[PDB]
Structure formats: structure tokens, C-alpha cells
């Protein structure tokens, strides 16, 4: 079955004013991936919009002329294939082609498929012990970081880097003999250890990438990195003026934490999503940014879930989608001849009754957005150029600590 749980909208202004819509604005409903809008605000509030995950690489010469490497981690939530390929290029620029002993500490996260299926839509792996985390990081280092580079994929990445004016070598390699976990408590460096820092892209771009893709891996790891559920609730009380009556979170993504038969979802009231949006926008404006720097733009962001959100929203809506078995959701803003308006639309679905519910819900949401645009005198196209959202940029090149 498909139906409207709740709809809200509010004009974007200096003040959070009149709200109109449908249904109970103060009833909690499953959010699906519009949860990421909230995760996005929380990350920006705690870390700062332009924050950079600064992974430190401790390189010590061995007698054979290779390097030992200790990775001091920054918990970088987009560290996988692409950032690995870039690091390999970078190592070769510094004349490092061979690593003897590669150690890493408790903060080094590496999931090769961070920006790819099935990590985008999958249940994010949750490591209960540090051991379990270490063994999975070993697995990735051993099987992916150290193996023959995928020539076609490296080349696609480099084509993008080149559009982004970031240099990468045509054909770099790395060899790694030994890989093991070494806690930060126990790492101390040799007299001849030189150490260098890899800054990932600014947080706003990591967020733009996450929101474009609906990346569960990135959203869920941000949530843990920020302190998990306890830290989240304090954030919701202080920033959103919201307690369990308004909002309950289990993860950063909005993904199902339970079973197919017995789902558990992040829930909030439609009001809470409007607050989030207003506060996220104010935050970004205070630093000279816009909502389009972290959320997708209809039609204009090709590599996003709203690439094909047609209708009069094309080029005139900034939004995040959401999809779980029990819900289809959308949140963001529309730009119209009467100004910009925040909105949140929450629909119920039942995939267990029919998978056709997702498609039906999708076109209902689109038509609802079009209707809201119609009633505000039609679309006004947004000033925006497609952000190419790479996990590194021109300040990601290796520099001395």
C-alpha cells in the first residue's frame, strides 16, 4: 500500500515561519535516507564544513631500500579504492614503490568498496571489537591495496581527477610484503622516520558524495565517528530542540537495522526535517556556502539519485531521496518565482505486498513537488555548476607533517 504519511513546507527566509502541508507534522515516521540530511548537519556542526580527515603516513627506510609504513588513521569515512589509488600515485611521486612492513592503528578505516555497490545500499559492517576491525582492514590491504591495480578503473578515476585539475601518474604500482595491526599506543618512530600527511577532500564534498549516492557506508561511519547514538541524542536536544518524542536514530544512513520481516528504522517528525533543513542552510550560509554544496541538485548532478527527477523540478530543486521497504521519502528545497521553500515528503510503501509500490510512490512524490512548484508561480532555475565529488582535491597531495 502507498500513501502519504506527512508533507511539510516552509518558505526559506531569515526566520522559520509558517508551515503547511498534509497529515500530522508532529508524528514520527520512518525517514529512510533523508536521515542523511540530519547526519550531514551533525557532521558539519561538530567538525566544521571544510574539515579534512588528515591521515598521517610514517615512512621509515629499510636496509634493502624499501620503506616501512605506519598509518596513523583519521577515521576517514571515504577511504577505499579511489583514495587508495591516489595514495599509490602519491607514494610513487615520493619514490616509494615498495613497502616492507605496513602497520596501521585503530583509526585507519579502509573499505575498498566505500564508494561502490554493495556498500552504497548495503548494511554497513559494524565491528564490535577492534580485533574485528583490524582483521577486515588487513583483508582489504592484503586483497585489494596490494594486488595488481585494475587498469580500467584506475584510468576512469584519473580521467575524473584530470577534469578536477588533480595530478595522478598514468601507471603507478605498489608492493607490500607484510601487513599487521599496531595500536597508536604502541607505535614509536625511528630516528630516520619521515612523516607525511594525506588530507582527504573537505567534509562538504565527502557529504555531497554521500548524499548524491545515498552512501550508507559513509553516513553510518560518520555517525559512529561522531560518537554514535548517545552523542546523537545530545546533538538533537541542543541543536534541533528534539527528544525521543520527535526523533529516534539507530544509524547515520536511515537504513534498516532490523530484519526484512521486522524492520527498524530511524524516525522523526516532518517538523524535525524542516528544522534540520533550515538550520543546515543557515550553517552553510554563515560560511559562504549553499545547500547545493552538500545535497544533490535535480537533473544537474548526473551522478546522483535525482539525475532523472524530471518535471518542473529539473534544475530547480535541491533534495535528498530515501527508499526502504516501508517508506519513500524526499526532503530539501524548491526554487520558485515566489522564492525558495523547504519541504519534506514522507510516504508509506509495502514492498512485501508489491515491489511495484516503489515506482508508484516515486511518481506521486514527483507530482507533489511539481504541484507545490505550480502553486508558487513555477520554477526558478538555481545558480549551480555540477560538483565533481572526488574524495581528494588539489590540497590532498602529500605534505610534511
Amino acid at each position: 500500500m502507498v500513501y502519504v504519511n506527512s508533507v511539510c513546507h516552509m518558505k526559506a527566509a531569515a526566520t522559520a515561519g509558517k508551515v503547511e502541508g498534509e497529515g500530522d507534522m508532529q508524528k514520527k515516521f520512518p525517514l529512510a535516507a533523508i536521515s542523511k540530511v540530519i547526519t550531514t548537519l551533525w557532521a558539519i556542526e561538530k567538525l566544521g564544513v571544510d574539515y579534512r580527515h588528515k591521515t598521517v603516513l610514517h615512512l621509515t627506510p629499510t636496509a634493502n631500500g624499501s620503506m616501512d609504513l605506519h598509518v596513523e588513521g583519521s577515521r576517514d569515512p571515504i577511504f577505499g579504492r579511489n583514495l587508495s589509488y591516489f595514495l599509490i600515485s602519491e607514494l610513487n611521486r615520493m619514490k616509494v614503490t615498495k613497502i616492507e612492513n605496513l602497520t596501521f592503528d585503530e583509526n585507519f578505516l579502509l573499505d575498498w568498496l566505500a564508494e561502490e555497490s554493495p556498500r552504497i545500499g548495503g548494511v554497513t559492517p559494524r565491528y564490535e571489537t577492534i580485533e574485528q576491525q583490524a582483521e577486515a582492514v588487513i583483508k582489504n590491504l592484503k586483497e585489494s591495496f596490494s594486488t595488481a591495480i585494475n587498469r580500467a578503473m584506475y584510468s576512469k578515476l584519473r580521467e575524473r581527477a584530470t577534469k578536477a585539475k588533480v595530478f595522478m601518474l598514468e601507471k603507478p604500482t605498489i608492493e607490500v610484503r607484510n601487513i599487521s595491526f599496531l595500536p597508536k599506543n604502541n607505535y614509536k618512530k625511528d630516528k630516520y622516520t619521515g612523516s607525511v600527511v594525506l588530507q582527504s577532500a573537505p567534509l562538504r564534498t565527502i557529504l555531497k558524495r554521500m548524499n548524491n549516492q545515498s552512501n550508507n557506508y559513509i553516513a553510518d561511519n560518520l555517525y559512529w565517528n561522531l560518537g554514535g547514538t548517545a552523542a546523537f541524542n545530545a546533538f538533537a536536544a541542543a541543536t534541533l530542540k528534539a527528544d525521543q518524542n520527535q526523533i529516534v536514530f539507530h544509524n547515520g544512513s536511515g537504513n534498516n537495522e532490523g530484519t526484512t520481516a521486522k524492520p527498524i528504522y530511524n524516525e522523526a517528525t516532518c517538523e524535525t526535517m524542516i528544522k534540520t533543513l533550515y538550520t543546515l542552510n543557515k550553517s552553510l550560509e554563515a560560511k559562504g556556502y549553499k545547500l547545493s554544496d552538500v545535497l544533490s541538485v535535480a537533473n544537474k548532478d548526473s551522478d546522483s539519485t535525482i539525475d532523472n527527477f524530471g518535471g518542473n523540478a529539473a534544475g530547480s530543486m535541491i533534495a535528498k531521496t530515501g527508499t526502504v521497504n516501508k517508506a519513500k521519502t524526499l526532503a530539501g528545497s524548491i526554487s520558485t518565482k515566489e522564492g525558495e521553500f523547504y519541504f519534506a515528503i514522507l510516504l508509506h510503501t509495502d514492498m512485501d505486498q508489491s515491489s511495484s509500490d516503489r515506482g508508484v510512490a516515486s511518481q506521486m512524490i514527483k507530482n507533489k513537488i511539481s504541484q507545490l512548484i505550480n502553486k508558487r508561480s513555477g520554477p526558478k532555475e538555481i545558480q549551480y555548476t555540477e560538483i565533481l565529488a572526488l574524495p581528494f582535491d588539489q590540497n590532498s597531495y602529500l605534505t610534511e607533517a
Binding site: 555497490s117 515491489s355 511495484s356 508508484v360 511518481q363 504541484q371 505550480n374
Partner: protein, 193 residues
């Protein structure tokens, strides 16, 4: 006998797990689950072009329908996986089909609102679909008149949409534009002849 694990893997984009389960060779890939779903439908719904191409290499049936009456092509279009739609059309998927919902929208209609390229690929198979109405007597021109743009209107006018068609309530596209308060499409239609 269908496979839950395979259907979920197809929907979610785990190509490695799909190939792994299909390699053991237990699974009939045309077996439909308790709601009529196939691995191909799940792959299309989830926008996973890699898994579609792999399943098409096994020569699955394109025209099976789930309980909602939808083929894999329909799952692709309705869920904005237009890269998958193109692959399925090139593979011989029937484009003269209905997508789910109360209205009986044609596949062409749903594509015309959302992706111009796939709308053209459909018409390239059957030009008359431009003017094929749904169950309420409405075509693409009616949908985009409500919820679309002047650019949409002229795209359809250029493909031969008929301005003067009436729906089952006796409304033209121009009438539904006005009823929807879409001043932009109303203007575009009411200047046209």
C-alpha cells in the same frame, strides 16, 4: 524455486554474490517469488546495470510480470534506472507496456516525464506511442502539462503530440494545465495551435 538471497543481491548491486550464487547452477533465473518478482526485475529496480548485463547473458525471459503487472523494463523506468532501460530496450524488451498505478500510464509517458533519451528510444520502436492514452484517456502531453515544463511540451509537439485530444472527462491538456495552476505550460499550450 526462486532464491531470496539472489533477488536481494540483485536489488542491492552485489554482483560478486550474484555471480557466486548463479555459478553453483541451482537457480532457475525465471523463477518468480511470492509477489511475482524475478532476479532481472530486482536488478532493474535497483539500477544495477552490471547485474542486468550478467543476467541478460543467461538469456532470461524479458516479459515476465510481477503482481503489479510490470516487466523489468517497467521496473527500470519507474525507478529512474534509465541506463538499465536502454540496455533492456537494446536487448529486445517490449516498450508498448503499462507501468503500475491507478492511471495505467504507458511506459512512454513515464519516460517522457523524466528522461528524454529513453522517451526517444521508445518512440524509435513505435512512433504512435506519442498519442497512446492511459486508462483515463490521458497521454504524455497531459502529464507534462500538469507537472512539466514548456521544453517538455515542445518536445512532445515535435514528436507529433495531438493538442486537441480530450481525456475521459472532456478536458484538453491546456485545460489540465490550468486546473493544475501550471502557468508556464498553460501559456506554451495556449499560444500553440
Amino acid at each position: 524455486k526462486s532464491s531470496k538471497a539472489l533477488n536481494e543481491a540483485a536489488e542491492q548491486g552485489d554482483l560478486a554474490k550474484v555471480k557466486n550464487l548463479v555459478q553453483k547452477n541451482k537457480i532457475d533465473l525465471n523463477a518468480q517469488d511470492e509477489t511475482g518478482m524475478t532476479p532481472l526485475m530486482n536488478a532493474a529496480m535497483g539500477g544495477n546495470l552490471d547485474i542486468v548485463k550478467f543476467l541478460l547473458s543467461k538469456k532470461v525471459n524479458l516479459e515476465l510480470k510481477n503482481n503489479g503487472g510490470e516487466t523489468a523494463l517497467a521496473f527500470a523506468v519507474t525507478n529512474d534506472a534509465y541506463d538499465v532501460a536502454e540496455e533492456l530496450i537494446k536487448a529486445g524488451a517490449n516498450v508498448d507496456i503499462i507501468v503500475a498505478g491507478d492511471e495505467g500510464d504507458t511506459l512512454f509517458m513515464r519516460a517522457a516525464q523524466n528522461n528524454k533519451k529513453t522517451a526517444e528510444s521508445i518512440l524509435a520502436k513505435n512512433k504512435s506511442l506519442i498519442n497512446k492514452a492511459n486508462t483515463l484517456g490521458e497521454t504524455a502531453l497531459f502529464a507534462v502539462a500538469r507537472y512539466g515544463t514548456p521544453a517538455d511540451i515542445d518536445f512532445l509537439i515535435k514528436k507529433g503530440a495531438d493538442l486537441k485530444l480530450k481525456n475521459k472527462k472532456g478536458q484538453t491538456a491546456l485545460d489540465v494545465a490550468k486546473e493544475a495552476s501550471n502557468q508556464d505550460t498553460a501559456k506554451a499550450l495556449s499560444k500553440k495551435k
